[model samples]
Structures are given as C-alpha cells and as structure tokens.
Target: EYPTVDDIPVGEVRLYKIGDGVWSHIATQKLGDTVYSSNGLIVRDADELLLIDTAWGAKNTVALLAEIEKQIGLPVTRSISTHFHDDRVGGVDVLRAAGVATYTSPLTRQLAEAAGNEVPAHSLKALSSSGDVVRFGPVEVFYPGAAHSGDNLVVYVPAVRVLYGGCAVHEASRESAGNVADANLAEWPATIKRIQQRYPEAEVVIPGHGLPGGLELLQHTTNVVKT
Candidate 1:
C-alpha cells in the first residue's frame, strides 16, 4: 500500500507518499520574500483515512483536502493535531465543518482555547508522561513528553515504520534549536530519549518542517536541543 497514489501537489503544499497508505502533507505558511513550511501526515487503515496535523493554515488545509479527494480518491475520516500550535491545528474548524472527527489532547485543547486559537472538537486523555500511549484509530499516538511545544505528540505508523515526530524531532539539517520561546529545555532531551526507546522500529522519521530522515534525526534533535 505504500505509494498507493501519486504525490499530490496543492499550491505551496505537497503530499509525499511515504509508506503503505501513508502520505506526508507539507504546507507553506507565508510567501513572497520568505516563507515558513510545516508538515503533517495522511494515513489509511481499516478503510478509513487518518490525518495528522492539517497543513499550516485553514486555507492550505482546504486546498490539501481538495487535492486529497481528487488524487487519493478518499475523504479524510479522522484527524488529530500534534500540538496546540497554529501550524499544527490551524485547520480544525475546516475539518470540523467537513464533518471530520478532529481530535487533540486535553492540554492542547486548553492551550488552544486559552490562546484564542481554533480547537479540535474531540479530546483524548493521556497521563502526560513519557512513553504514554494513546490509541486513535490505527494511529499509535505516543506522548513522549513536551519538547518543541507542550502537547506535541508523535504518531508511529507501524505498517510503514514511519514516525511522524512533528517538531519535537528536528529535521536532520537543523543545526540547533533555533527557537525556545515556548520550548521545554529541561524536558526536551528526555522526551527524545523516550521516543527512540519506544519506537525502535521507525525507519522513516519526519519533522514538522523540511526533509524527512532516519532514526538519527532523533539523536540529532537531542544534540541540537542540548547545543
């Protein structure tokens, strides 16, 4: 099922097929002189498609959906935000209106609601401890503890051995943790350690931005955080 469909290009966003029934949707936030990019995933299991994150904004999410239907030929059945950050949960309202079952952590809901951001309709409870596992459909939602942002969770698609690390695991090209405004420096290292220990089978690791890498991306992020 890996690459069951061709890569979908929608404006500044593209959905790259990674594994069996899994695709990574990347969206550009701004354009013109400079731009910022974010990443998410679209997966299928049991005849249902699961979307992780939702592009960078609502408009991008809308276009991504259109491409998904036209290219993948299936409607996204469910979606979950990795964190409360706008780059991750910006499309909750769009998905909600489309009748998609959007989900997030209790803390994500609280943070998003408190910040006047779009919050998901459903909430999944977990112990907030490292290595805690929250099952959503076939997605292995692993709460590896807060790093890049609180409420940031990772998804491990066992079928494809891909671990959607989001921003919690920095891309290989990143030299260091460039921003720490809302980062948990103290908990960051331990968080990555837990992620590696929990999902040793991960063959493809994707950060929230830039290119995807191997398991070394986890170690790279840990060292980057400490740097």
Candidate 2:
C-alpha cells in the first residue's frame, strides 16, 4: 500500500513530473527483504503515455500497467523499445495485444525482429526524426539517437527537466556496469555528451536502471567510459 510522503514504504510508487505534461513512475524492487534497485521509467504526455522499457514478463507488465492506470488514471499511449534486450522489450507482445503503439529506432526494430520473436507488424513503429516531438497531452518525447544500442534513443521531457537516458547513460557505481556485448561503446559517450549539451537544464536524469540522478551523473558516466 502507498504510504504518506514522509513515510514512503518499500516497493512504493512515486510520481515525478519531468516536464509540462510528462510524468514518470518510480517503483522499488525488493529481494529477500532487501532492495536491489529500481528499474526503468514510465513517461506520459496528454495524448500519449509511453513506457521506455518493460521489466520481465507479461504478468509483471499487467501489474505495472494496473498501477500506472490506478495512479495516472489513463491508458498507455505508446511503448518505446530502448534496445532488443528481453528484459527491456520482452512484453512487447503483451502491450501490443493491449492495443498500445510500440516504437523504436529502425535499426532496433530490424535487429529485434531478426534476433527476438516476431512481433506484430502493426505493433512496431519507427521513430520519425532525430529530435521529433511525441505529444500526449502537453508533454513531448524527443528522439535523440542510438547511443547504448544501434537503435537506442533518449527521451527528453523539457518542462520539469527530466531526461530518460535508456542505456545510453551509464551508471556511476560498479554494481551497475555489466557486459554491454552489443553496446556501441565508442559512440555511447558522444551520444551522452550530446544529450547533456541538449538538455543542460535537466534537473533529474533517469537511467534504465538504478537510482534517479542528475546531469553530473551523466557526465560521470562519460568520464568512466572514457577511462
């Protein structure tokens, strides 16, 4: 159950306004009475609600969506695949079945389709431009570029200065860095640098996993990757 702001409980969900009409849900995950970390971001605009990446399975997706609907009181408008990882887009079938529009970079779609399961043709949509706007209500989703994966893209919410850097923005802690077998390491840093330059005013930065951080974290990621 959700507790008061001061008494935030474990696994509790928090609402953060990243931009004018864009909001995100930050949920906690506990294992054997210990909290490992938080994973992913859920962003929405007036006309559209987009999930950056999904967790594990269809059941989890259902529960998460239920919570999202309970909290936000709106249906999800879209889904954006950050990469072809199962942990990221495993539930594309689930969401697509639910009538949510899914989007990803053209490269990502091709890679996922080849390597992953055959997602419905109608469910997968490619991002339009490098910096195009996706409207929900009053919020917008800006497509940056492929940083983490050949098809990875970052979502920027301008109003509240919230930037969702999928796998593009690496974690500062060692616990967060894992094998990026398919990562474009050389181009990753430059992509993040571009994000930093573009969203200089971003107050809160949410990576694919771990804790929500700031622009300094993004800079630290670049520095770490460089070394």
Candidate 3:
C-alpha cells in the first residue's frame, strides 16, 4: 500500500510525474544540469503526499527530499520502493528520517538485507507481490512484475494516462539496453503486453531512464527486446 494525501497542492508541483505513486526528480533550475538516478512517483490528494521510490545513494535521496520539502510545505507520508536497486531504494533512510514510512516488496527487502547493505529492516514493510495494485486515495499503483529486477514494480496513474515502467521499459532509440543481470528478458515482452492490455488508455510511458514518451516508445522497446 502507498501513502494517502489529505491535501493537494493548488499550484503546479514541479516534478516528473511518472505515474500514480511514481515520480522522477527534475532539477530545472537555471539549466537542466543535474540528473538524479531516480525513477519514482508521488501522489498528492486533498490531505497527504506519497512517494513511490527514492533514488541512488543517501546524498541524492536527501537532496531530493529537501527539494520536495522546499517546493511543497508537506512531508512524505509514505513511500514504496520499486525494487532493491540502489537507484530505487537507496533513499529509504532519507524518507525515514523525515518520519515517512518506507514500503518494499518482500523479496527486495530479503535480498537487500541478505547483502548487508545497511538497510533498516524495522523501517521496511514487505509488499505482498511485485505488481500488486496499491491505492492511495484517487491514485493507484501497480506492480508489473520483475523486469529490471526481481522486485521491480510498475505504477500507473489513470488520471494522467501515465505508466511508470521502472527499469522494465527502456528507450529503444537510446542505443543502450537495460540492466541484464537483474532483468527478466524472456518475460519482458509479455510483461509489457500485460501493462498495455491493463492500461490501454496510457498516453505517457515513463521508463526508469530516458525521456517520457507514448505508445510508440513502448512498441519500440518491445522490438528492441526481440532484436
């Protein structure tokens, strides 16, 4: 389950809205110079805000949290990590320090803890499955199974017609593939098909890397996997 928001910002909240409970940090100051290794979402309702994934390393996560606080005078009520990758869950402590509850898939937590990566077991609550739909107010998050990693999850925001595919869907035109070590290559096509079938209305596709796109981008990725 993700966090519930009792309040929503009246003005535009500067963020890369990947999906319902997913977002990526966008540092658009004087110029787009800084790029944080993060692919996550945040949902803002009438009362609270929920962050889906943090980002890579403690420093980046802390900076991201600080940026969010500065933009919106609200704290993260809850957080859900898409997987165990440092880019995804490295910011658990950042959110926890701000009193935000961190959530992760059971397998992700198990694997991370086994590696002795200093992950706080007490701060993490296990998710039932990788792609289970978690609702927070009007927002909904879906775990689309593991593609980039065994614990990868997808978050979808029906309102915005956006699907946060995590590292599962890559930008085919980028000339670079995705993480193979933790990727489910064989199941990736079907997984994308499932996401398409489930959210046929999706107009924006937010991958773990690259720019946000549409169905054409999704199809291009599917083709890349075959090639």
Candidate 4:
C-alpha cells in the first residue's frame, strides 16, 4: 500500500508520514550563517519505534518525542545515525536520556567523538560490515561503500519497500552534492550504483535533505556525483 503524505507541524519541526508506520521528520539547523532543512526517518516495527536520525537539537527532539508518542502511542526504543554529522546525531543525547539505545557505524562513532559530538552508546560495527546485511527488527541497514560520509548507510524497510538513502544519495532536483566536506567524490557514483543494484525494488527512496522519490533519485544522484 502506498503511504498517504501528511505534513503535520510540531513546533519548528514538521512530521511527514507516508504510511501508518513510516514517517520522516523535517527540521532545520544552522551551520555558520547558513540555515538549512534536513530530514530523518521514523520506522515503527511491531510495538517498537526506530529513529533513523534525530531532530536538530534537544529542544526539537523533545518536541519530536511528544509528537511521535502522541501519534503512535509508543516511545522510541532504538535509533541509528546514518553518519557522524551533528545534523544527523544532534539529538542523540536526548534519545539517550529517554533510554533509547542508539547505534551507528564505528567510523561514525569515532568521527563524532573527534568532532566533540555525542557518541552513540552502541556501535553497529559488531552487528554490521560493509556489504553485510544487519537486521534491526524488520528493517535492514546496508553499508554499500563510502560516499557522502565514510560511514554513510542506507536503511530498508522490507514491509513497505522504502529505502532511506541518508546523505549518500541526492534528490532529483539537486544539481550537485549538498555537503561534500567529507564525501568521497571519486567513489560516490559507484557507491550509489551499488545501492541501486542492492535494492532494485525499493518503491520509495528518501534522501537525507530533500523530497523522497522513486528510483530516479538514485540515478540523478549518480549523475550529479559524476559531474
């Protein structure tokens, strides 16, 4: 079944649900003088809620928690940062305070710690490796290769055939990679190609900071990375 899109505002954050159990939180943050919006995913598996990334900061995360519980009637039990960037893991401390067990790649953990960001209590290294499938409830996390970040990952919800392509891929409307400060431009195209080959049947592809689309997003990202 296709997800009906709903944009519900909670404070400064916007929650967009594509289906009953899958949603994305659209929020904004500032890097220097540039204020930009980014997105994270929420996946409900059975009675548990898994957060892909988090809101911009603690206050926004608190509001996000309220909204999530209000809509789902369950608290978030687990979370994973797609990369080490603050925009992706800024709310980790909030999640930890609420007893949510967060996971991330070891590389991400090291990078965050080096950058003076909160490091996830749990690391995914023991449970996953590049090209290996790591199962978290019903969703699968795959590390195709380095692209947007050394530890960038893609999450797949088998139930809905939706692929969360974190910052590794770009939306169709994007003419170039948004933030490549840590991106591997030389290998990005091949990394995306691996994603397309790995999850050829993904019905909906969600990018890290833009509107979700079908497989065309993957293709567009590959094209942009090659330019």
Candidate 5:
C-alpha cells in the first residue's frame, strides 16, 4: 500500500510520509510575519536512510537528525543536495560533520562556490549536459536540465513512485515562478517536460517549498513555466 502523509513534528521541522518507506521534511524560517518553508526527502534503504536535501541551517540540521533518529532509529548514510541554493545545501556541513556522505552535481558545486557556499567534499559530475541518472540503493537521481537553477536535480524513488522535484517545480498555490534570480525562464518548461516523460509513474510529487501532491504538480509547473 502507498504510504500516507503524516505530519510528524520534530522540533523546528515537520515530517511528512509520502509513501511506505519515504518521508519529506519541512523546515520553516520566520522573517517578521512571513514564514518560509523548505522541503527535503528521506528514503529508507534497508538499515540506513538516504536524505535528498538538508534543513535550512546547522541548528535545524542537527535537530532534524535527532528527530529522524527518534522516529526511525537509523543513521543517515548518505545525502544529496538538489542544487546550490541554501535551502538545499545549507546543512551539508552538519551532515558532513556527522560523518554522513554528501554529494551534489559538479555544476552545483561551482554555483555554490560562486555563491560563497562550497558543496560537500564528495561531488558528482553531470552524466551529460542534458541530464543523467544516478542509482544507489532504491533511489535514482535525475538531472534532466537546468530550470530553477543551473544545477537543479530531481530524485525519483521507483519503490514508492515518488518524485522529489526540488526547487525546479512549484506547488499549485504559487502564483508564478519564484526566485528566478538564478533560473532559466526559457528552459524551465522543457526541463519539467523532461521530468514528466522520465517519471510518468510518479504518484507523489514533492516540491522544494510547499505541500506534496500528485502528478498534477508536474503539470502545474509546466503550465507555469509556459506562461
């Protein structure tokens, strides 16, 4: 059976179960009345856990690890950041410090470095300019093309049929493409289209910053990018 969404609160982070062995963490940062949230995916692989992204910062990352241990009682064996954004790789240092292996695309590393944030020591280069797939355990990391950022990537779990679209996609509640400061407007639609074709069976779609939903989220992003 598909896993149901459960709001498991872990101190400053909120966890949601997207499927039987998959979970997403939502971390919030408040600036005055504005509350911003970031989403990261977690997948259980036998005895260890695979984290897709990190919390917003070191404190939250530490808190998130404690909560994950409290809930699953397993250590995060590996982690991969989807892009160079702070929301994606901000807590990489904490993860590295905890002895968890962290990785990201070479372009993401370059972008992160340019933005004054170096990626974790272990980094993966693009399989191809268009994209490439990396498989480890039960998950596949797909980098179809640049959209929201020059180094954006999405995670797919064939076991649960869940797609972690990262910041390249958006929730329906968003009115427009957000944070285009580093986005490629012209290439965004095509990038999402690639994702749709690549993971047509994705039942649960998780975005970088909002609630998780169905495949409609992919369509929503395509439509938004077109306009």
Candidate 6:
C-alpha cells in the first residue's frame, strides 16, 4: 500500500501507517458531551522516532506513547509541536519526562507559555522565525504563513511524501468555523495554495483533528476556509 490507512486501534488511540517510515496517530478527547479528536505523526528515522504533535493531555500522551513503542519498536528521541494549542503541544511535559527532546518554533513556545501550557525545551527560532524550513533528519517543519494559528507549522516528511498540516488544515467532519479564536482568515486559504505548490510530491496529507487523506484534503481546506 503506497498510500492507505493501515489502522491499528488501541483503545482511545489509533495508530496507522500512512507511508514508508511514517505512521500517523489519532486520539480522542472528550469535553462534556462532545468528543474531539487530534492527529499526530510518528516518523521512523533510522532506529529512532520523531514525534510530530501529541495527544490532548499528559495521561493520554502517556497511554499513546506506551502503545506506540510497543507496536512500532522504536523509541522517540525527539519531538516537536505544530502550534500552541492543547491538542498540539499538550504532552510536552510528558514527552520531556520520558527523555524525549522536545522542540518547537519560538513563536509556539512563547504562545504556549503565555497560554500556561507545558512548553517545549528547545526553540527553533532562526529557521521558524526567518520563514525557512526547519530540518530534522528527513523531516522538515515549514510554515506557509499563518493559517489556523499564527504559530501553526506544517511538518513534511520528504522520505515518505507525507505532510502533517496540523490545525491549520481542516477536517471535513469538523465545521470550518468550529474554532476561529486565532485563525488567519485572510491567509488560511492562501497558505494552502502555497503548500500545494511547495509539496507537489505530498500524496499523504494529515489533518490535526481527523483521519488522513490525500492532497485533496488541502484543496478541501482551501475551498472551505474561504472566510
């Protein structure tokens, strides 16, 4: 399967392989009568794992990490968040405690701290702030301007042609206007356009809060986010 969802549901967290060396995870967070989902990636780089995004909270992250290591057979050496949202970087403290070196853009860190959430240890200031792609092994964190959040980052895995667009990319199931607290209405669609051009090889596209899809998800996002 060059590009298909190989779903492996383990309790509240489901792990699926999107492509070679790239696995995606989806975990749910129930808020009152509503259950919200968030997705992240587990990329295999040699013997180590690189985690992009995380579950909504510490316990959920702990459960997810346990399942991931048990199944993937690789320890996550480093991790990064796409934005400052709880669904994105909520597990920073847990990851740090598990000996994972967590990182994020300086803007994400600043916003996370201000939001009173656990912040990542390292800041990718130069590359993220300068609008250059931040590279880590085979993965690259690219910011196509602001979309869902000013600090939202798009994580690209070139080796597998997978793109994790975080919350900046919308899921068809969730209303496009579900949460616009920090949305960049004017730039949201524009950013997707640039992203499409920047990663034409990206066949597997991931959303922050739903199942994965092909490049068409970007087009869907572009079409629906036209505020």
What RMSD does each model have against the real structure? 3.5, 4.8, 7.5, 3.1, 3.1, 3.1
**Runs in model 2 lying further than 4 Å from the true structure:** 1-38, 117-146
| Cα RMSD for predicted model 4 | 3.1
Estimate TM-scores for all models. 0.92, 0.75, 0.77, 0.91, 0.92, 0.91
Model 4 ranges off by over 4 Å: 1-11, 126-129
lDDT tens readout by residue for model 1, 1-227? 22211332334467788878989987776555656667899998767789999877788889889878876888788898999888888888999988899998888899999888899988887736767897777678998898998778999988779999998988877897866777898999999999999998889998987788899999899898886
Q: State the lDDT of candidate 3 residue by residue for 1-227, as single tens digits.
A: 21111121211123654454445553211115543333466666556777767755566567667767786556778776767777677757877787887776677788677765435333233345544566654456666665666667777776777677777778545555545776777777777776777778887777665566777766676777774
Residue 125 deviation, candidate 6, in Å? 3.3
**lDDT score at residue 32, model 2, on the 0-100 scale:** 63
Q: Give lDDT for model 5.
A: 0.83
Off by over 4 Å in 6: 1-11, 129-131
Q: Runs in model 5 with CA error above 4 Å?
A: 1-11, 31-33
Model 1 error, position 31 (Å): 8.4
Give me the overall lDDT of model 3: 0.62
lDDT tens digits by residue: candidate 5, 63-174 = 8898799888889989999899888888899999999999888888888988987486677755447668988677998988989987899999998799999999898788
Worst 10 residues of 3 by lDDT: 2-11
Q: Write the per-residue lDDT of candidate 6 for residues 1-227, one digit (tens) a residue.
A: 22212342323576778888888877777677776767888999889999998777897799879878788988999998889989888888999999999998889999999999889999876555424686886798887888888888899998778999888787765555468888888888778888888889988889887767788888888777765
